[PDB]
């Protein structure tokens, strides 16, 4: 919301998990027994970046 | 980096479309050569 | 359900390699595509 | 003998010629096949 | 017309033939050149 009031351009379609990780990395994360959950995927991105 | 590949990939396809256009022109030219060579050879066999 | 998710995971993986490899083929070929018949065969196999 | 001498050389030449025309026919066959395959490749690469 | 029909086919066939013989002549030329070059290589490799 704040970026909108500041006229800072950002896309509102792509999810944060898709923009911060690739499908190849998510495939390996599943093989490592990471639960198929968006919050769990967000945690994996944090554990990498 | 992605935009670099797309521009190269697009330009190779566009060049390819040009190549077949002249190759079809070459194909027509080679057909004309066959017509000339075949006609010249037949008249020579006739003189024979 | 479990088998399909494994199958669909591999299938989506393969398509990503296929679009990457096909892009690489056009980004690493010199001159024209038609000149090297190997590049033409590789594109057909990747497309197939 | 003067005619057999005219004919000999001329016919040898026309055999060299019709063979040359036949060789070009193979070249045209290679060209036309390359046109169709590259056109099919271009049609297959239309989506990409 | 029956003779012109006999002759047409036979002469087309003999043109395909003399062209085939000429193509083999190129093959023999490639073979004989390969013999001389490999023999010279063998003579050059005699000391080694």
PDB file of C-alpha atoms in Angstrom:
ATOM      1  CA  UNK A   1       0.000   0.000   0.000  1.00  0.00           C
ATOM      2  CA  UNK A   2       2.773   2.449   0.897  1.00  0.00           C
ATOM      3  CA  UNK A   3       4.532   1.885  -2.429  1.00  0.00           C
ATOM      4  CA  UNK A   4       1.255   2.669  -4.209  1.00  0.00           C
ATOM      5  CA  UNK A   5       0.909   5.996  -2.388  1.00  0.00           C
ATOM      6  CA  UNK A   6       4.542   6.757  -3.297  1.00  0.00           C
ATOM      7  CA  UNK A   7       4.043   5.911  -7.010  1.00  0.00           C
ATOM      8  CA  UNK A   8       6.633   3.122  -6.741  1.00  0.00           C
ATOM      9  CA  UNK A   9       5.924   0.587  -9.476  1.00  0.00           C
ATOM     10  CA  UNK A  10       5.562  -3.073  -8.511  1.00  0.00           C
ATOM     11  CA  UNK A  11       3.659  -6.014  -9.960  1.00  0.00           C
ATOM     12  CA  UNK A  12       0.746  -7.467  -7.981  1.00  0.00           C
ATOM     13  CA  UNK A  13       0.338 -10.765  -9.876  1.00  0.00           C
ATOM     14  CA  UNK A  14       3.421 -12.886  -9.134  1.00  0.00           C
ATOM     15  CA  UNK A  15       3.537 -14.472  -5.694  1.00  0.00           C
ATOM     16  CA  UNK A  16       6.497 -13.777  -3.430  1.00  0.00           C
ATOM     17  CA  UNK A  17       7.518 -17.450  -3.418  1.00  0.00           C
ATOM     18  CA  UNK A  18       7.640 -17.551  -7.226  1.00  0.00           C
ATOM     19  CA  UNK A  19       9.640 -14.315  -7.478  1.00  0.00           C
ATOM     20  CA  UNK A  20      12.289 -15.373  -4.928  1.00  0.00           C
ATOM     21  CA  UNK A  21      12.824 -18.990  -6.020  1.00  0.00           C
ATOM     22  CA  UNK A  22      12.849 -21.006  -9.232  1.00  0.00           C
ATOM     23  CA  UNK A  23      10.901 -24.168  -9.989  1.00  0.00           C
ATOM     24  CA  UNK A  24      14.130 -26.193 -10.041  1.00  0.00           C
ATOM     25  CA  UNK A  25      14.965 -25.199  -6.464  1.00  0.00           C
ATOM     26  CA  UNK A  26      11.416 -25.889  -5.275  1.00  0.00           C
ATOM     27  CA  UNK A  27      11.600 -29.358  -6.839  1.00  0.00           C
ATOM     28  CA  UNK A  28      14.750 -30.129  -4.843  1.00  0.00           C
ATOM     29  CA  UNK A  29      13.205 -28.647  -1.689  1.00  0.00           C
ATOM     30  CA  UNK A  30      10.361 -31.159  -1.973  1.00  0.00           C
ATOM     31  CA  UNK A  31      12.905 -33.978  -2.290  1.00  0.00           C
ATOM     32  CA  UNK A  32      14.449 -32.684   0.955  1.00  0.00           C
ATOM     33  CA  UNK A  33      11.073 -33.292   2.680  1.00  0.00           C
ATOM     34  CA  UNK A  34      10.060 -29.629   2.780  1.00  0.00           C
ATOM     35  CA  UNK A  35       6.264 -29.444   3.241  1.00  0.00           C
ATOM     36  CA  UNK A  36       4.300 -28.306   0.183  1.00  0.00           C
ATOM     37  CA  UNK A  37       3.186 -25.061   1.803  1.00  0.00           C
ATOM     38  CA  UNK A  38       3.643 -21.411   0.858  1.00  0.00           C
ATOM     39  CA  UNK A  39       4.891 -20.396   4.309  1.00  0.00           C
ATOM     40  CA  UNK A  40       7.281 -23.361   4.289  1.00  0.00           C
ATOM     41  CA  UNK A  41       8.482 -22.275   0.840  1.00  0.00           C
ATOM     42  CA  UNK A  42       8.952 -18.741   2.182  1.00  0.00           C
ATOM     43  CA  UNK A  43      11.037 -20.187   5.020  1.00  0.00           C
ATOM     44  CA  UNK A  44      13.199 -22.123   2.551  1.00  0.00           C
ATOM     45  CA  UNK A  45      13.900 -18.901   0.637  1.00  0.00           C
ATOM     46  CA  UNK A  46      14.927 -17.280   3.925  1.00  0.00           C
ATOM     47  CA  UNK A  47      17.174 -20.275   4.680  1.00  0.00           C
ATOM     48  CA  UNK A  48      18.906 -19.682   1.323  1.00  0.00           C
ATOM     49  CA  UNK A  49      19.098 -15.872   0.987  1.00  0.00           C
TER      50      UNK A  49
ATOM     51  CA  UNK B   1      20.638 -11.707 -19.674  1.00  0.00           C
ATOM     52  CA  UNK B   2      17.257 -13.162 -20.655  1.00  0.00           C
ATOM     53  CA  UNK B   3      16.579 -10.247 -23.007  1.00  0.00           C
ATOM     54  CA  UNK B   4      19.974 -10.888 -24.611  1.00  0.00           C
ATOM     55  CA  UNK B   5      19.088 -14.490 -25.484  1.00  0.00           C
ATOM     56  CA  UNK B   6      15.632 -13.545 -26.776  1.00  0.00           C
ATOM     57  CA  UNK B   7      17.074 -10.907 -29.112  1.00  0.00           C
ATOM     58  CA  UNK B   8      19.664 -13.365 -30.433  1.00  0.00           C
ATOM     59  CA  UNK B   9      17.074 -16.131 -30.722  1.00  0.00           C
ATOM     60  CA  UNK B  10      14.650 -13.863 -32.567  1.00  0.00           C
ATOM     61  CA  UNK B  11      17.310 -12.604 -34.984  1.00  0.00           C
ATOM     62  CA  UNK B  12      18.419 -16.137 -35.895  1.00  0.00           C
ATOM     63  CA  UNK B  13      14.826 -17.052 -36.764  1.00  0.00           C
ATOM     64  CA  UNK B  14      14.419 -13.883 -38.839  1.00  0.00           C
ATOM     65  CA  UNK B  15      17.680 -14.625 -40.656  1.00  0.00           C
ATOM     66  CA  UNK B  16      16.467 -18.189 -41.257  1.00  0.00           C
ATOM     67  CA  UNK B  17      13.302 -16.893 -42.947  1.00  0.00           C
ATOM     68  CA  UNK B  18      15.552 -14.827 -45.221  1.00  0.00           C
ATOM     69  CA  UNK B  19      17.799 -17.812 -45.995  1.00  0.00           C
ATOM     70  CA  UNK B  20      14.967 -19.996 -47.299  1.00  0.00           C
ATOM     71  CA  UNK B  21      13.674 -17.107 -49.428  1.00  0.00           C
ATOM     72  CA  UNK B  22      16.968 -16.897 -51.317  1.00  0.00           C
ATOM     73  CA  UNK B  23      17.309 -20.688 -51.229  1.00  0.00           C
ATOM     74  CA  UNK B  24      13.924 -20.957 -52.940  1.00  0.00           C
ATOM     75  CA  UNK B  25      15.255 -18.355 -55.374  1.00  0.00           C
ATOM     76  CA  UNK B  26      18.362 -20.523 -55.712  1.00  0.00           C
ATOM     77  CA  UNK B  27      16.082 -23.546 -56.151  1.00  0.00           C
ATOM     78  CA  UNK B  28      14.363 -21.776 -59.048  1.00  0.00           C
ATOM     79  CA  UNK B  29      17.761 -20.776 -60.462  1.00  0.00           C
ATOM     80  CA  UNK B  30      19.021 -24.367 -60.278  1.00  0.00           C
ATOM     81  CA  UNK B  31      15.848 -25.490 -62.062  1.00  0.00           C
ATOM     82  CA  UNK B  32      16.604 -23.005 -64.848  1.00  0.00           C
ATOM     83  CA  UNK B  33      20.144 -24.389 -65.089  1.00  0.00           C
ATOM     84  CA  UNK B  34      18.743 -27.910 -65.489  1.00  0.00           C
ATOM     85  CA  UNK B  35      16.414 -26.750 -68.269  1.00  0.00           C
ATOM     86  CA  UNK B  36      19.280 -25.063 -70.131  1.00  0.00           C
ATOM     87  CA  UNK B  37      21.710 -27.964 -69.679  1.00  0.00           C
ATOM     88  CA  UNK B  38      19.135 -30.612 -70.616  1.00  0.00           C
ATOM     89  CA  UNK B  39      18.026 -28.693 -73.715  1.00  0.00           C
ATOM     90  CA  UNK B  40      21.624 -28.089 -74.811  1.00  0.00           C
ATOM     91  CA  UNK B  41      22.553 -31.777 -74.295  1.00  0.00           C
ATOM     92  CA  UNK B  42      19.521 -33.154 -76.229  1.00  0.00           C
ATOM     93  CA  UNK B  43      20.263 -30.974 -79.317  1.00  0.00           C
ATOM     94  CA  UNK B  44      23.894 -32.235 -79.175  1.00  0.00           C
ATOM     95  CA  UNK B  45      22.697 -35.896 -79.089  1.00  0.00           C
ATOM     96  CA  UNK B  46      20.496 -34.975 -82.120  1.00  0.00           C
ATOM     97  CA  UNK B  47      23.567 -33.566 -84.008  1.00  0.00           C
ATOM     98  CA  UNK B  48      25.120 -36.861 -83.145  1.00  0.00           C
TER      99      UNK B  48
ATOM    100  CA  UNK C   1      -2.271 -38.984  -6.877  1.00  0.00           C
ATOM    101  CA  UNK C   2       1.296 -39.502  -5.634  1.00  0.00           C
ATOM    102  CA  UNK C   3       2.491 -40.996  -8.933  1.00  0.00           C
ATOM    103  CA  UNK C   4       0.962 -38.163 -10.962  1.00  0.00           C
ATOM    104  CA  UNK C   5       2.601 -35.480  -8.816  1.00  0.00           C
ATOM    105  CA  UNK C   6       5.945 -37.206  -9.349  1.00  0.00           C
ATOM    106  CA  UNK C   7       5.216 -37.552 -13.076  1.00  0.00           C
ATOM    107  CA  UNK C   8       4.052 -33.941 -13.414  1.00  0.00           C
ATOM    108  CA  UNK C   9       7.085 -32.728 -11.477  1.00  0.00           C
ATOM    109  CA  UNK C  10       9.409 -34.527 -13.885  1.00  0.00           C
ATOM    110  CA  UNK C  11       7.359 -33.412 -16.898  1.00  0.00           C
ATOM    111  CA  UNK C  12       7.511 -29.725 -15.949  1.00  0.00           C
ATOM    112  CA  UNK C  13      11.223 -30.162 -15.230  1.00  0.00           C
ATOM    113  CA  UNK C  14      11.830 -31.599 -18.702  1.00  0.00           C
ATOM    114  CA  UNK C  15       9.954 -28.783 -20.449  1.00  0.00           C
ATOM    115  CA  UNK C  16      12.118 -26.206 -18.664  1.00  0.00           C
ATOM    116  CA  UNK C  17      15.273 -27.948 -19.892  1.00  0.00           C
ATOM    117  CA  UNK C  18      13.747 -28.218 -23.373  1.00  0.00           C
ATOM    118  CA  UNK C  19      13.070 -24.484 -23.630  1.00  0.00           C
ATOM    119  CA  UNK C  20      16.480 -23.704 -22.120  1.00  0.00           C
ATOM    120  CA  UNK C  21      18.361 -26.076 -24.435  1.00  0.00           C
ATOM    121  CA  UNK C  22      16.461 -24.878 -27.508  1.00  0.00           C
ATOM    122  CA  UNK C  23      17.293 -21.280 -26.589  1.00  0.00           C
ATOM    123  CA  UNK C  24      20.948 -22.237 -26.071  1.00  0.00           C
ATOM    124  CA  UNK C  25      21.108 -23.859 -29.514  1.00  0.00           C
ATOM    125  CA  UNK C  26      20.073 -20.618 -31.217  1.00  0.00           C
ATOM    126  CA  UNK C  27      22.367 -18.606 -28.918  1.00  0.00           C
ATOM    127  CA  UNK C  28      25.503 -20.695 -29.576  1.00  0.00           C
ATOM    128  CA  UNK C  29      25.269 -21.297 -33.343  1.00  0.00           C
ATOM    129  CA  UNK C  30      27.475 -19.253 -35.668  1.00  0.00           C
ATOM    130  CA  UNK C  31      26.623 -18.051 -39.148  1.00  0.00           C
ATOM    131  CA  UNK C  32      23.265 -19.450 -40.242  1.00  0.00           C
ATOM    132  CA  UNK C  33      21.199 -22.310 -38.843  1.00  0.00           C
ATOM    133  CA  UNK C  34      20.696 -23.913 -42.267  1.00  0.00           C
ATOM    134  CA  UNK C  35      24.460 -24.145 -42.836  1.00  0.00           C
ATOM    135  CA  UNK C  36      24.908 -26.752 -40.078  1.00  0.00           C
ATOM    136  CA  UNK C  37      22.444 -29.628 -40.427  1.00  0.00           C
ATOM    137  CA  UNK C  38      23.328 -30.765 -36.895  1.00  0.00           C
ATOM    138  CA  UNK C  39      21.683 -27.663 -35.406  1.00  0.00           C
ATOM    139  CA  UNK C  40      18.564 -28.328 -37.492  1.00  0.00           C
ATOM    140  CA  UNK C  41      18.377 -31.926 -36.260  1.00  0.00           C
ATOM    141  CA  UNK C  42      18.847 -30.859 -32.633  1.00  0.00           C
ATOM    142  CA  UNK C  43      16.041 -28.292 -32.859  1.00  0.00           C
ATOM    143  CA  UNK C  44      13.690 -30.889 -34.345  1.00  0.00           C
ATOM    144  CA  UNK C  45      14.551 -33.410 -31.623  1.00  0.00           C
ATOM    145  CA  UNK C  46      14.065 -30.809 -28.883  1.00  0.00           C
ATOM    146  CA  UNK C  47      10.796 -29.722 -30.503  1.00  0.00           C
ATOM    147  CA  UNK C  48       9.717 -33.349 -30.953  1.00  0.00           C
TER     148      UNK C  48
ATOM    149  CA  UNK D   1      36.218 -41.373 -90.559  1.00  0.00           C
ATOM    150  CA  UNK D   2      35.946 -37.552 -90.333  1.00  0.00           C
ATOM    151  CA  UNK D   3      32.300 -37.972 -89.175  1.00  0.00           C
ATOM    152  CA  UNK D   4      33.262 -40.834 -86.769  1.00  0.00           C
ATOM    153  CA  UNK D   5      35.930 -38.435 -85.439  1.00  0.00           C
ATOM    154  CA  UNK D   6      33.327 -35.548 -85.173  1.00  0.00           C
ATOM    155  CA  UNK D   7      30.773 -37.846 -83.523  1.00  0.00           C
ATOM    156  CA  UNK D   8      33.252 -39.488 -81.090  1.00  0.00           C
ATOM    157  CA  UNK D   9      34.349 -36.198 -79.443  1.00  0.00           C
ATOM    158  CA  UNK D  10      30.834 -34.628 -79.498  1.00  0.00           C
ATOM    159  CA  UNK D  11      29.206 -37.722 -77.865  1.00  0.00           C
ATOM    160  CA  UNK D  12      31.948 -37.967 -75.192  1.00  0.00           C
ATOM    161  CA  UNK D  13      31.261 -34.260 -74.457  1.00  0.00           C
ATOM    162  CA  UNK D  14      27.442 -34.810 -74.284  1.00  0.00           C
ATOM    163  CA  UNK D  15      27.919 -37.767 -71.909  1.00  0.00           C
ATOM    164  CA  UNK D  16      30.089 -35.520 -69.688  1.00  0.00           C
ATOM    165  CA  UNK D  17      27.193 -33.013 -70.003  1.00  0.00           C
ATOM    166  CA  UNK D  18      24.221 -35.231 -69.246  1.00  0.00           C
ATOM    167  CA  UNK D  19      26.189 -36.556 -66.265  1.00  0.00           C
ATOM    168  CA  UNK D  20      26.777 -32.946 -65.213  1.00  0.00           C
ATOM    169  CA  UNK D  21      23.044 -32.281 -65.547  1.00  0.00           C
ATOM    170  CA  UNK D  22      22.287 -35.394 -63.485  1.00  0.00           C
ATOM    171  CA  UNK D  23      24.728 -34.211 -60.810  1.00  0.00           C
ATOM    172  CA  UNK D  24      22.908 -30.867 -60.665  1.00  0.00           C
ATOM    173  CA  UNK D  25      19.625 -32.782 -60.325  1.00  0.00           C
ATOM    174  CA  UNK D  26      21.005 -34.307 -57.124  1.00  0.00           C
ATOM    175  CA  UNK D  27      21.992 -30.803 -56.001  1.00  0.00           C
ATOM    176  CA  UNK D  28      18.459 -29.552 -56.681  1.00  0.00           C
ATOM    177  CA  UNK D  29      17.063 -32.530 -54.762  1.00  0.00           C
ATOM    178  CA  UNK D  30      19.314 -31.631 -51.825  1.00  0.00           C
ATOM    179  CA  UNK D  31      18.204 -27.993 -52.088  1.00  0.00           C
ATOM    180  CA  UNK D  32      14.469 -28.730 -52.266  1.00  0.00           C
ATOM    181  CA  UNK D  33      14.664 -31.153 -49.333  1.00  0.00           C
ATOM    182  CA  UNK D  34      16.510 -28.485 -47.344  1.00  0.00           C
ATOM    183  CA  UNK D  35      13.777 -25.965 -48.189  1.00  0.00           C
ATOM    184  CA  UNK D  36      11.006 -28.259 -46.948  1.00  0.00           C
ATOM    185  CA  UNK D  37      12.848 -29.265 -43.772  1.00  0.00           C
ATOM    186  CA  UNK D  38      13.772 -25.675 -42.906  1.00  0.00           C
ATOM    187  CA  UNK D  39      10.234 -24.501 -43.675  1.00  0.00           C
ATOM    188  CA  UNK D  40       8.870 -27.216 -41.379  1.00  0.00           C
ATOM    189  CA  UNK D  41      11.419 -26.137 -38.768  1.00  0.00           C
ATOM    190  CA  UNK D  42      10.240 -22.540 -39.168  1.00  0.00           C
ATOM    191  CA  UNK D  43       6.616 -23.641 -38.817  1.00  0.00           C
ATOM    192  CA  UNK D  44       7.598 -25.717 -35.779  1.00  0.00           C
ATOM    193  CA  UNK D  45       9.442 -22.662 -34.414  1.00  0.00           C
ATOM    194  CA  UNK D  46       6.484 -20.340 -35.055  1.00  0.00           C
ATOM    195  CA  UNK D  47       5.186 -20.744 -31.498  1.00  0.00           C
ATOM    196  CA  UNK D  48       8.618 -20.173 -29.952  1.00  0.00           C
TER     197      UNK D  48
ATOM    198  CA  UNK E   1       5.786 -43.867 -82.513  1.00  0.00           C
ATOM    199  CA  UNK E   2       6.477 -47.344 -81.043  1.00  0.00           C
ATOM    200  CA  UNK E   3      10.199 -46.860 -81.892  1.00  0.00           C
ATOM    201  CA  UNK E   4      10.165 -43.237 -80.555  1.00  0.00           C
ATOM    202  CA  UNK E   5       8.607 -44.726 -77.390  1.00  0.00           C
ATOM    203  CA  UNK E   6      11.304 -47.535 -77.279  1.00  0.00           C
ATOM    204  CA  UNK E   7      14.105 -45.035 -77.928  1.00  0.00           C
ATOM    205  CA  UNK E   8      12.845 -42.392 -75.439  1.00  0.00           C
ATOM    206  CA  UNK E   9      12.907 -44.731 -72.394  1.00  0.00           C
ATOM    207  CA  UNK E  10      16.151 -46.524 -73.438  1.00  0.00           C
ATOM    208  CA  UNK E  11      18.049 -43.207 -73.977  1.00  0.00           C
ATOM    209  CA  UNK E  12      16.788 -41.747 -70.662  1.00  0.00           C
ATOM    210  CA  UNK E  13      18.066 -44.968 -69.006  1.00  0.00           C
ATOM    211  CA  UNK E  14      21.490 -44.744 -70.783  1.00  0.00           C
ATOM    212  CA  UNK E  15      21.861 -41.090 -69.722  1.00  0.00           C
ATOM    213  CA  UNK E  16      21.134 -42.152 -66.113  1.00  0.00           C
ATOM    214  CA  UNK E  17      23.795 -44.853 -66.745  1.00  0.00           C
ATOM    215  CA  UNK E  18      26.574 -42.793 -68.279  1.00  0.00           C
ATOM    216  CA  UNK E  19      26.042 -40.289 -65.457  1.00  0.00           C
ATOM    217  CA  UNK E  20      26.320 -43.188 -63.006  1.00  0.00           C
ATOM    218  CA  UNK E  21      29.549 -44.267 -64.709  1.00  0.00           C
ATOM    219  CA  UNK E  22      30.864 -40.696 -64.517  1.00  0.00           C
ATOM    220  CA  UNK E  23      30.003 -40.583 -60.807  1.00  0.00           C
ATOM    221  CA  UNK E  24      31.990 -43.790 -60.274  1.00  0.00           C
ATOM    222  CA  UNK E  25      34.888 -42.191 -62.175  1.00  0.00           C
ATOM    223  CA  UNK E  26      34.957 -39.477 -59.511  1.00  0.00           C
ATOM    224  CA  UNK E  27      34.903 -42.212 -56.863  1.00  0.00           C
ATOM    225  CA  UNK E  28      37.852 -43.944 -58.543  1.00  0.00           C
ATOM    226  CA  UNK E  29      39.684 -40.607 -58.702  1.00  0.00           C
ATOM    227  CA  UNK E  30      39.082 -40.154 -54.969  1.00  0.00           C
ATOM    228  CA  UNK E  31      40.283 -43.717 -54.342  1.00  0.00           C
ATOM    229  CA  UNK E  32      43.456 -43.442 -56.434  1.00  0.00           C
ATOM    230  CA  UNK E  33      44.378 -40.101 -54.851  1.00  0.00           C
ATOM    231  CA  UNK E  34      43.872 -41.670 -51.420  1.00  0.00           C
ATOM    232  CA  UNK E  35      46.153 -44.561 -52.407  1.00  0.00           C
ATOM    233  CA  UNK E  36      48.964 -42.234 -53.485  1.00  0.00           C
ATOM    234  CA  UNK E  37      48.659 -39.966 -50.442  1.00  0.00           C
ATOM    235  CA  UNK E  38      48.553 -42.884 -47.999  1.00  0.00           C
ATOM    236  CA  UNK E  39      51.460 -44.576 -49.782  1.00  0.00           C
ATOM    237  CA  UNK E  40      53.456 -41.342 -49.525  1.00  0.00           C
ATOM    238  CA  UNK E  41      52.460 -41.148 -45.856  1.00  0.00           C
ATOM    239  CA  UNK E  42      53.656 -44.730 -45.386  1.00  0.00           C
ATOM    240  CA  UNK E  43      56.935 -43.912 -47.132  1.00  0.00           C
ATOM    241  CA  UNK E  44      57.237 -40.783 -44.983  1.00  0.00           C
ATOM    242  CA  UNK E  45      56.487 -42.940 -41.918  1.00  0.00           C
ATOM    243  CA  UNK E  46      59.041 -45.593 -42.912  1.00  0.00           C
ATOM    244  CA  UNK E  47      61.754 -44.026 -40.747  1.00  0.00           C
ATOM    245  CA  UNK E  48      59.448 -43.673 -37.738  1.00  0.00           C
TER     246      UNK E  48
END
